[PDB]
Amino acid sequence: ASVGFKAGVKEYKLTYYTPEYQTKDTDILAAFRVTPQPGVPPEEAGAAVAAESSTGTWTTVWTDGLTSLDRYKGRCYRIERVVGEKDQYIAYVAYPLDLFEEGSVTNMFTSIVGNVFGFKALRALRLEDLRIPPAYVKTFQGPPHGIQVERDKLNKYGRPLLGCTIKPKLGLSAKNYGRAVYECLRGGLDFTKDDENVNSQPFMRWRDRFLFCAEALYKAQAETGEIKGHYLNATAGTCEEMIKRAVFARELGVPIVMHDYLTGGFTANTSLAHYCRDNGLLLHIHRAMHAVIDRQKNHGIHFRVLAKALRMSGGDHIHSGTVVGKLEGERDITLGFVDLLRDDFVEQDRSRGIYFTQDWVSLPGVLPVASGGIHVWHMPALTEIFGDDSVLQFGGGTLGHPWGNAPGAVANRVALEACVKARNEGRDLAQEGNEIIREACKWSPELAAACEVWKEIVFNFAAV
Amino acid sequence: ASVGFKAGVKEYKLTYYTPEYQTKDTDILAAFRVTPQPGVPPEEAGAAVAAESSTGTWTTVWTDGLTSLDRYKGRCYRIERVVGEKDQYIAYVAYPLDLFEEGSVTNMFTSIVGNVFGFKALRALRLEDLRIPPAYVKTFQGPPHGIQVERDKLNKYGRPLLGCTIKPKLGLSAKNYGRAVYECLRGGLDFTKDDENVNSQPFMRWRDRFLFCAEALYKAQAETGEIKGHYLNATAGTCEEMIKRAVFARELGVPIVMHDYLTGGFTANTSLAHYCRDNGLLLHIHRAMHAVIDRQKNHGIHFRVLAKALRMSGGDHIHSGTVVGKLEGERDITLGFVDLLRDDFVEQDRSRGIYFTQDWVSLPGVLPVASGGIHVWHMPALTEIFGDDSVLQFGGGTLGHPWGNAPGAVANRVALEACVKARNEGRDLAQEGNEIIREACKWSPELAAACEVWKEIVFNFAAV
Amino acid sequence: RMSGGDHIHSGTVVGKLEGERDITLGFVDLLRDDFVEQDRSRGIYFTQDWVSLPGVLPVASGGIHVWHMPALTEIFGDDSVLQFGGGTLGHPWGNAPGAVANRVALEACVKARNEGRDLAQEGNEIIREACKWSPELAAACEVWKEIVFNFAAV
Amino acid sequence: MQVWPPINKKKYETLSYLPDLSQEQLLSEVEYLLKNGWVPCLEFETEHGFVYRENNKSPGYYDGRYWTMWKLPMFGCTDATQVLAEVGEAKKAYPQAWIRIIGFDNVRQVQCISFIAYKPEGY
Amino acid sequence: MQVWPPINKKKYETLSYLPDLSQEQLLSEVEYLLKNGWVPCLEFETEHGFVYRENNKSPGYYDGRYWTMWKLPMFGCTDATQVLAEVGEAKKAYPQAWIRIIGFDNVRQVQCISFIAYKPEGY
């Protein structure tokens, strides 16, 4: 209370534009890229985004006096012009800790991005980054396991982990799936996996696929003498269904399951991360639907946020993009968020799109996955851009090799070891790239067959 | 099989562009609005969209011969130029039934929108509509109850249902939340509800909120002699959490719960709808996050699809927009999806954005909710646009009344009953609107007070 | 011993943390014996009959090494667990060897005892002797030879 | 087109898909390790050349991952040559051992590297 | 610094870490046993020199603990030398047996002592 209740509308500006404000170390901060509507002062646009995101509505309600908005109000503490840009700004908003439910990305998302993106007063809105305070980070479980334990479990060090998505996407039988799996794995891939839309359909039922890929990976691991795994997709239509599948994988002794976190949802993911933690499965996150949110530079949510959100809710691996392949993605930005995915502390670096220093107070890091339209000739670049702490996946690039899967595997495994040694001997994957695999193509019949096939392919197209 | 395996890339066009195609009654069809990259022929764009959405990848894999893509391939059976538009088209794709897991919106979305929106070859992609076949509709539960049984249960006929979102957004104590609730409902509101972001927080914990709102709705119901309800937010961070809250609302005997389906997720929503169905709770859906996906006319998903997705997943109420208030929404489009939400069959009508005839084979219909920045002076319009089968909500519009909640409730009940009778006597809500409430303001003290306060407010701003 | 435990730490007398010999002897019997007669000498103010409750195995830990072997063995008897934290991962050739060191040290003490030597008087030669025949044991002896934790008790 | 054999191609993780590493080549490795700050360490196994699952099958459990430490991690060492020495030193004594070389990043606590330095006869 | 061998060092509990007990040495033992009131007993095993876990793996279950009693616990005996005898007696007849000597405290019911009196060839 204090100050009479005076009914009626007032600009947002009056309460949620606070340039005065001194951020608290426990505040959630957000960098929104706002583009107002013609007559809207940025500081009003900016104040609406903060109000309608925290404590306020469009008119004056007496109830405010029951509590104290100074404590609760979300607040726009600064605007910045987007240099060389169409009436577009960076409104910075700070959200007090007290506003968020502990352990819940769902909650956090409901607040920050709940309703503001549809304001009539704005024409476009996009969240670029969020500063998650340690006081909030400590309330999440985060990854079931993270980078070190994963390596430690599968016993695998020095070099990118290799994987392949069986294809065709849909239409293969429980049994063919197995066949294909075994064949890719014995070749020398570390993992094979279900395509993100392989759940349980009339052509192949989850329980059938799960039973045979278990048979197969077990065959391929005995054969090679190297721990193998096949990502078994637990994405389902109901949490009960979802857990039920994760439960079978556990019954089989297999090591990793997978889940489409955005089509599944944060509420369901969080549940699976907990289930994995307690049951010891590694969980692979697939980011289906994402580009629906993260493509346009003017409206939506940037992937670096989507990525943060996942290290929070739970996942051992997350698909981070390839720079160099079939889907969109620039190098600097990717580098930025990949550190957001694996490091303990990441210093703010506008160069790379990181608007805030992120301190993860030891939440496990997540292994980024490079996938989609990549082949043998990209090896040295991937290797370069990502480092050993990455998973590199060959779908088309494995089942696409002229002599079948086993060989297609062997090709990739050599391509990569090749690149890895070049690197270690001191070669320069960026300059010297091309000779290196070129060189190895010469000594490897399977590697060769590959080289010849995808030699001329690139996906150069001017990015969004 | 048949036709030698011939390794290497080939244009999508060769298999996913099939203008020949005669759509089967059981095919899922999707109208995508595609904007290619400069050198991309629409028919290639369109086929990339169909291949990378159903059965194929970027190069040739022998496994296709193991199955038969004629049966399974997703196929682009037609393109259309977007009259008076920047190299933008309507690619129309057809997905055979066999590809989707029964009952799972999760799976459907994973397929249709999984990866295509981030193709380098495209610069913008947007799903405008999806035709759900009766063979797939029948695999869904749909709403726990739907329009008829909800009216039947609450005993309410001939007029829009009235509701209010308690404000401030965040920051009120369990106790104060109840007080506010009792006060709003005794006034004449049918429902009050949790703000989509009120879950369980330091300032007010879910079980304390639920316990006091029950005490309060029970007080107001007894007082007025009319069934009351308070939407209790079950949105939580894990399914287990979610169910757990749903279970207490059941214990208290209260009639309706609520869930933010998009931040929650389809997996978790569906599980709640089931639980609600079996325990007879009505479910109110809050579409938080939706504008991140549905705003831009060139990229994303259109709400009519999000709307469809929910009638499948399960919801008794879904927010449909207001046209006339604080957030974006145009009248025709709106009328369009509102029919997609409530009617049994909805004839195609490009006028209104409906690209395909939708037959719901008796799936219950969902009550649209009109909310956000609406007041007394909008009554006649809303009534007009939406009719009896709607819920009209007054947040600010209720707690912002000069004489507090009770009177503000009364104000809206009278305004609405006012419009309803005008309508029934044959007046014309659209022409005669303004006098009607204006006339009422004259006889009702509480209504008056309201009229005077919001008289000058409107939210006219040129739409996106 | 009432609530439940198979092992309980009982102290070391001779190592890093506080504890006097008699008192210790006193409750060690309270932990393992069936009947324990009252002995104000040893701090036991009452006769304690456990009417067959099973007894617990006392554990000797914290700041103990190769050169304490004979005493511990002396003071505790076979029915005891003796623990080597630092005394094991503190050995110059790492853990295995360190293990081996303590094992020999202890089996060493055990036979001397059984041959009739006097762990208390003859202590010191006994391990000293064995350090001679055991490479791992020697490495040990050399490193912790001068260490003791004599400080006037509370 | 040729059938990747199904029979005597048991692997050893990193580098086992390139041709047998020459001592020079191998030297490059210990060199890299070093260059980076990893403490080099050695472990040899004379009986279970490959993972098994005899004691348990829960997810993640495999018997045979742990190997025997050869002496101790050579903290402070900077002579690439000295670790190589060790390899020699161990095939002498465990001619039938599989010997490997690993690199500890102590700040991250991860084995930043590992490559087999020596397979016994007929592997 | 030397690498404790990972291979032919199977133990046999108490005393197996000191050098092979001479008969004198062994005699001290049976002597001690007696000194105390323990009933000496003998048990030999010719097939499962070490614990296993074939029939079960619950906590505490190990197959391979029980061994065959050699005759009966020699109650009332006081001739250290007579038990020794027995030892001799059994290697005669079960040359391939592991033979062990134990001592029963009948008041506490605990084997107060146990030391192998004879490994077969090549152990």
Ligand SMILES: O=C(O)[C@@](O)(COP(=O)(O)O)[C@H](O)[C@H](O)COP(=O)(O)O
């Ligand atoms: O289904 C696919 O298209 C892939 O499985 C790869 O198969 P290919 O390797 O044969 O193309 C994609 O990488 C991820 O699934 C795409 O996403 P992301 O950008 O999120 O990695």
Ligand SMILES: O=C(O)[C@@](O)(COP(=O)(O)O)[C@H](O)[C@H](O)COP(=O)(O)O
């Ligand atoms: O939180 C709010 O702002 C409301 O609660 C309304 O409060 P007011 O009535 O006081 O504004 C909104 O209608 C819906 O929540 C907005 O979304 P939708 O467009 O999805 O209806």
Ligand SMILES: O=C(O)[C@@](O)(COP(=O)(O)O)[C@H](O)[C@H](O)COP(=O)(O)O
């Ligand atoms: O943590 C420790 O210090 C120890 O673990 C010993 O480690 P070291 O053997 O390396 O000292 C201590 O015995 C008991 O834990 C101390 O207590 P207690 O008096 O009850 O036995």
Ligand SMILES: [Mg+2]
């Ligand atoms: Mg995929």
Ligand SMILES: [Mg+2]
């Ligand atoms: Mg709301």
